[PDB]
Amino acid sequence: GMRLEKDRFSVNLDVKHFSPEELKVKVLGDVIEVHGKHEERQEHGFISRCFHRKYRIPADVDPLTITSSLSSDGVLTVNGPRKQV
């Protein structure tokens, strides 16, 4: 989930059922949203699965400094520094 730390925040989520292309991280102002959507039309099969998470960003984080990465074990991290002295 979301961790506020002294000099940063960090969001860590399990997304192992999603490929990187099926993930979206949106940062709009003080809100971060993470979405995943997987759809496929399998003879009969149709499968869809989705997730959505939203978190509020602390006011002393410049949203433009927020970045994200995906580990090979399928853990998605989104983090950003807080303004430092």
């Binding site: 979206k24 949106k26 940062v27 709009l28 994200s68 990465s69 090979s72």
Partner: peptide
């Protein structure tokens, strides 16, 4: 780790 692009619109 792979970098994940951030959508800002």
């Amino acid at each position: 780790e792979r970098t994940i692009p951030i959508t800002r619109e």
